Design an enzyme around this catalytic site. Structure first.
Site, PDB file in Angstrom:
ATOM      1  N   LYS B  50     -14.221   9.055 -10.915  1.00 31.71           N
ATOM      2  CA  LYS B  50     -14.220   8.052 -12.004  1.00 31.71           C
ATOM      3  C   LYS B  50     -15.856   7.721 -12.195  1.00 31.71           C
ATOM      4  O   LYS B  50     -16.101   7.444 -13.369  1.00 31.71           O
ATOM      5  CB  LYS B  50     -13.589   6.796 -11.768  1.00 31.71           C
ATOM      6  CG  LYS B  50     -11.865   7.146 -11.713  1.00 31.71           C
ATOM      7  CD  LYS B  50     -11.310   5.882 -11.557  1.00 31.71           C
ATOM      8  CE  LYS B  50     -11.414   4.924 -10.104  1.00 31.71           C
ATOM      9  NZ  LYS B  50     -10.629   5.679  -8.950  1.00 31.71           N
ATOM     10  N   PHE B  91     -20.240  11.311   0.597  1.00 34.28           N
ATOM     11  CA  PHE B  91     -20.323  11.701   1.996  1.00 34.28           C
ATOM     12  C   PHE B  91     -19.060  11.028   2.711  1.00 34.28           C
ATOM     13  O   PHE B  91     -18.394  11.514   3.488  1.00 34.28           O
ATOM     14  CB  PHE B  91     -21.510  10.792   2.419  1.00 34.28           C
ATOM     15  CG  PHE B  91     -21.612  10.266   3.799  1.00 34.28           C
ATOM     16  CD1 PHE B  91     -21.717  11.095   4.902  1.00 34.28           C
ATOM     17  CD2 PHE B  91     -21.661   8.996   3.970  1.00 34.28           C
ATOM     18  CE1 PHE B  91     -21.955  10.566   6.207  1.00 34.28           C
ATOM     19  CE2 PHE B  91     -22.016   8.361   5.098  1.00 34.28           C
ATOM     20  CZ  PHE B  91     -21.909   9.119   6.416  1.00 34.28           C
ATOM     21  N   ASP B  96     -13.882  11.460   5.310  1.00 35.43           N
ATOM     22  CA  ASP B  96     -12.591  10.881   5.506  1.00 35.43           C
ATOM     23  C   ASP B  96     -11.478  11.749   5.240  1.00 35.43           C
ATOM     24  O   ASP B  96     -10.252  11.506   5.738  1.00 35.43           O
ATOM     25  CB  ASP B  96     -12.480   9.243   4.551  1.00 35.43           C
ATOM     26  CG  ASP B  96     -10.904   8.894   4.524  1.00 35.43           C
ATOM     27  OD1 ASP B  96     -10.315   9.121   3.424  1.00 35.43           O
ATOM     28  OD2 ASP B  96     -10.686   8.059   5.381  1.00 35.43           O
ATOM     29  N   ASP B 100      -8.465  12.320   7.720  1.00 30.66           N
ATOM     30  CA  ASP B 100      -6.810  11.873   7.383  1.00 30.66           C
ATOM     31  C   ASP B 100      -6.362  13.047   7.219  1.00 30.66           C
ATOM     32  O   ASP B 100      -4.972  12.839   6.901  1.00 30.66           O
ATOM     33  CB  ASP B 100      -7.203  11.044   5.999  1.00 30.66           C
ATOM     34  CG  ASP B 100      -7.623   9.417   6.278  1.00 30.66           C
ATOM     35  OD1 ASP B 100      -7.628   9.270   7.385  1.00 30.66           O
ATOM     36  OD2 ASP B 100      -8.086   8.919   5.361  1.00 30.66           O
ATOM     37  N   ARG B 105      -8.417  16.332  -3.146  1.00 28.06           N
ATOM     38  CA  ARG B 105      -9.474  15.149  -3.634  1.00 28.06           C
ATOM     39  C   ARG B 105      -9.985  15.448  -5.116  1.00 28.06           C
ATOM     40  O   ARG B 105     -10.433  16.529  -5.552  1.00 28.06           O
ATOM     41  CB  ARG B 105     -10.710  15.137  -2.630  1.00 28.06           C
ATOM     42  CG  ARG B 105     -11.620  14.139  -3.015  1.00 28.06           C
ATOM     43  CD  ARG B 105     -11.256  12.717  -3.015  1.00 28.06           C
ATOM     44  NE  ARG B 105     -10.946  12.242  -1.250  1.00 28.06           N
ATOM     45  CZ  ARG B 105     -10.418  11.061  -1.210  1.00 28.06           C
ATOM     46  NH1 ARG B 105     -10.352  10.152  -1.925  1.00 28.06           N
ATOM     47  NH2 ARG B 105     -10.222  10.581   0.309  1.00 28.06           N
ATOM     48  N   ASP B 167      -9.660   1.162  10.865  1.00 28.33           N
ATOM     49  CA  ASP B 167      -8.750   1.890  10.127  1.00 28.33           C
ATOM     50  C   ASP B 167      -7.937   2.918  11.245  1.00 28.33           C
ATOM     51  O   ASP B 167      -6.764   3.189  11.258  1.00 28.33           O
ATOM     52  CB  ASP B 167      -9.318   2.751   8.803  1.00 28.33           C
ATOM     53  CG  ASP B 167      -8.359   3.344   8.055  1.00 28.33           C
ATOM     54  OD1 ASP B 167      -7.525   2.733   7.446  1.00 28.33           O
ATOM     55  OD2 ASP B 167      -8.467   4.673   8.064  1.00 28.33           O
ATOM     56  N   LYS B 193     -14.058  -1.757   5.287  1.00 24.14           N
ATOM     57  CA  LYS B 193     -14.051  -0.169   4.838  1.00 24.14           C
ATOM     58  C   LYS B 193     -14.630  -0.023   3.332  1.00 24.14           C
ATOM     59  O   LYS B 193     -14.775   1.133   2.794  1.00 24.14           O
ATOM     60  CB  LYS B 193     -12.854   0.592   5.231  1.00 24.14           C
ATOM     61  CG  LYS B 193     -11.380   0.157   5.087  1.00 24.14           C
ATOM     62  CD  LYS B 193     -10.631   1.487   4.730  1.00 24.14           C
ATOM     63  CE  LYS B 193      -9.209   1.439   4.531  1.00 24.14           C
ATOM     64  NZ  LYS B 193      -8.377   2.623   3.843  1.00 24.14           N
ATOM     65  N   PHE B 232      -8.855  -3.930  -4.900  1.00 24.59           N
ATOM     66  CA  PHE B 232      -8.832  -2.385  -5.074  1.00 24.59           C
ATOM     67  C   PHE B 232      -8.234  -1.487  -3.897  1.00 24.59           C
ATOM     68  O   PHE B 232      -8.091  -0.340  -4.275  1.00 24.59           O
ATOM     69  CB  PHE B 232     -10.499  -2.221  -5.519  1.00 24.59           C
ATOM     70  CG  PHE B 232     -10.567  -0.814  -5.791  1.00 24.59           C
ATOM     71  CD1 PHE B 232     -10.909   0.174  -4.725  1.00 24.59           C
ATOM     72  CD2 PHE B 232     -10.857  -0.128  -7.031  1.00 24.59           C
ATOM     73  CE1 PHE B 232     -11.322   1.567  -5.087  1.00 24.59           C
ATOM     74  CE2 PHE B 232     -11.290   0.971  -7.494  1.00 24.59           C
ATOM     75  CZ  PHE B 232     -11.476   1.753  -6.321  1.00 24.59           C
ATOM     76  N   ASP B 236      -5.358   1.415  -4.214  1.00 23.65           N
ATOM     77  CA  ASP B 236      -5.438   2.556  -3.423  1.00 23.65           C
ATOM     78  C   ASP B 236      -4.394   2.754  -2.372  1.00 23.65           C
ATOM     79  O   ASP B 236      -3.781   4.088  -2.331  1.00 23.65           O
ATOM     80  CB  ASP B 236      -6.801   2.532  -2.774  1.00 23.65           C
ATOM     81  CG  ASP B 236      -6.835   3.860  -1.991  1.00 23.65           C
ATOM     82  OD1 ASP B 236      -7.200   5.051  -2.919  1.00 23.65           O
ATOM     83  OD2 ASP B 236      -6.833   4.016  -0.604  1.00 23.65           O
ATOM     84  N   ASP B 237      -3.769   1.715  -1.831  1.00 23.04           N
ATOM     85  CA  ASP B 237      -2.610   1.912  -0.725  1.00 23.04           C
ATOM     86  C   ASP B 237      -1.260   2.171  -1.685  1.00 23.04           C
ATOM     87  O   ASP B 237      -0.683   3.204  -1.267  1.00 23.04           O
ATOM     88  CB  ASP B 237      -2.688   0.981   0.272  1.00 23.04           C
ATOM     89  CG  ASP B 237      -3.665   0.708   1.207  1.00 23.04           C
ATOM     90  OD1 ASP B 237      -4.678   1.727   1.186  1.00 23.04           O
ATOM     91  OD2 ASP B 237      -3.919  -0.260   1.823  1.00 23.04           O
TER      92      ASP B 237
END
Ligand code: YL2
Ligand code: YL2
Ligand code: MG
Ligand code: MG
Ligand code: MG
Ligand code: MG
Ligand code: MG
Ligand code: MG
Lengths: 346, 346
Positions: B50, B91, B96, B100, B105, B167, B193, B232, B236-237
């Protein structure tokens, strides 16, 4: 020499460094566990090496500041910048071990291979990078050299990542091309991946700390310290295969990982068209038999003898470079360092 | 709003950024291939998002500099710092995704899953971190704010790695403990984070660039921008599970990865002792059936409705915070940002 003298003091300073990087929870209790983990990372990954680089920061400081100007705090700061270079190192190793699929480092199992860590190692590593700049802020904030040091570390990081990129592009998994493995390429690789941060970085940091910030004073130093670095990485490539894992603290992988090692580059130059094919057919493969074929072929060309020849001629060449370019710096700065790595076996 | 206006200009500036980060081979031809690889990394990993964060640097700049003081170069620099925040982002994401075990992505396959990249991704990522400070040097070297920005980025990196550490410590693979998954812990996690680097970092960078370097001006801004960040990350979750992979550009993993997601924290608070056990028994496991049991249980507690409730009440609360703490800053700076993320679905 002067190095062996200064170690005990340098190593004891590691506790303060840790008491200090974990005084952030003495303002923010909600991150305790993250600090705990950070301690742990540091303990495991900052310790157990030779400490050449950190000590080289401190030795070079003695030798460049007039002892009047060496107050208690001046020293303490130099210990820290010294440690800052060891953190840099720590961060590169934790992550080069994942990338290189290595098993052991400094005579223990690699951080990422620990049960319960794996690829969390990637954060762990970057936390170590972070800690450098947190120390620079906390100790050298008010100094005339601060910005020079910050640019120095970052700048040196970047060149070292550049060098790592070539190391990897030149050694693609499961793709044994040996056209790629040349003298010119090798020199470029080690220049970027090893020499700037292992040799220039720590000396120049000592120079910045002593107000010697002149372009030409750093350029000359560099001519020396870069060739020194080349030699040191060649040493590193030799030990990968021919060292003692009891001593180096690490098991080798250049062959398995298809690396542009000093060894392989020398091999190609000497090998018969016949021999080229053993190499082509056994290089860069995870099979013990095929690794062994290559070691043997290397021993077949008495490459460990060529190592010893090269190590003598480069050490001389370096000494020439110290005669030519040390001035106005005490030759000792460069010599102490050279002695500590010549004929090295760990 | 003002964001949609400024994008085309921001996105076109990416080419210059790349022509510039690859002008290092216009001094050192021996690293061509590494620069090539760097270009490639940038192209693949800096693009397709975005751009909220980068644009927020530029929007906030318009709104804080008197247009007299907005010469061509002033803008160009602001584009860069804007891009510097997008590199930070790049980065973190590249790395991540490895940590993860993510698949996609920004609607393509994750960089590390590409054939021929894998864990070389770890270098790729850090090169992206490097590029920030190379840009700051090359564009803002002579400015009064330089050091403030350098400390800002690093400082924000460090807090973000701290946050990442929690996390991960709170979500250990193959170890389903849910004692760990609380409100207090969640708040701490997302604060570190997400909030510092996605919300404070870019506004404060704009403030530093406009000579607004006051402790209290940054503290107030922060009170706002941190709560905004919390909201935010909750968004995201929610999208991890309930979004549209056609739209978010990414497939979810919080459940598989045993994450302290906003969802799971809300679930525990509502679940019957009966229901607690479905969760315990299906959470943090790679099995589609078990993931599905949890989604269903979440839908069983009408958690998407609770999301929408919370999203309304936090947006109000934030608006209260802008009324209280915006001054002397134009409320618009904070509002533009708030509008761009309220009721967001990508
Ligand atoms: O594993 P080692 O200790 O033999 C040796 N390690 C290094 N030796 C000299 N220079 C460097 S630079 C380096 C490194 C690590 C990580 C990175 C990227 C994360 C930044 C970049 C460079 C590892 C390394 P190498 O043969 O893997 O090159
Ligand atoms: O994968 P996403 O995009 O859902 C999200 N990504 C992020 N969102 C908000 N903040 C952060 S911080 C972050 C990150 C990445 C890498 C690192 C370590 C290498 C430094 C630290 C933090 C990823 C991330 P997360 O649910 O994985 O948290
Ligand atoms: Mg390596
Ligand atoms: Mg290695
Ligand atoms: Mg090696
Ligand atoms: Mg994550
Ligand atoms: Mg993720
Ligand atoms: Mg997420």
């Amino acid at each position: 020499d002067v190095y062996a003298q200064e170690k005990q003091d340098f190593v004891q300073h590691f506790s303060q460094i840790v008491r200090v990087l974990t005084e952030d929870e003495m303002g923010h209790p909600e991150i305790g566990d993250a600090i705990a983990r950070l301690k742990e990372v540091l303990e495991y990954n900052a310790i157990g090496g030779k400490y050449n680089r950190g000590l080289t920061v401190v030795v070079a400081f003695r030798e460049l500041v007039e002892p009047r100007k060496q107050d208690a705090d001046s020293l303490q700061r130099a210990w820290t910048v010294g440690w800052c270079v060891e953190l840099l190192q720590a961060f590169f190793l934790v992550a080069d071990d994942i990338m290189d699929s290595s098993l052991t480092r400094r005579g223990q199992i690699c951080w990422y291979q620990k049960p319960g860590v794996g690829l969390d190692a990637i954060n762990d590593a970057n936390l170590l990078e972070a800690c450098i700049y947190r120390l620079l802020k906390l100790y050298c904030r008010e100094q005339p050299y601060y910005l020079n040091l910050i640019e120095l570390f970052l700048q040196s990081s970047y060149q070292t990542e550049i060098g790592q990129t070539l190391d990897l592009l030149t050694a693609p998994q499961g793709n044994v091309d040996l056209v790629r493995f040349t003298e010119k390429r090798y020199k470029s690789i080690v220049k970027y991946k090893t020499a700037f941060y292992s040799f220039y970085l720590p000396i120049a940091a000592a120079m910045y700390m002593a107000g010697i910030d002149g372009e030409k004073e750093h350029a000359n130093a560099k001519k020396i310290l870069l060739e020194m670095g080349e030699f040191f990485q060649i040493q590193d490539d030799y030990l990968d295969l021919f060292g003692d894992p009891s001593v180096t603290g690490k098991i080798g992988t250049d062959i398995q990982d298809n690396k542009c090692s000093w060894l392989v580059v020398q091999c190609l130059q000497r090998a018969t068209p016949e021999q080229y094919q053993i190499l082509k057919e056994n290089y860069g493969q995870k099979e013990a038999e095929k690794v062994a074929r290559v070691k043997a072929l290397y021993e077949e060309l008495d490459l460990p003898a060529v190592f010893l020849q090269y190590e003598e001629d480069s050490y001389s060449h370096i000494m020439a470079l110290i005669e030519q370019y040390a001035a106005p710096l005490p030759p000792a700065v460069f010599l102490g360092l050279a002695r500590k790595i010549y004929k090295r076996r760990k």
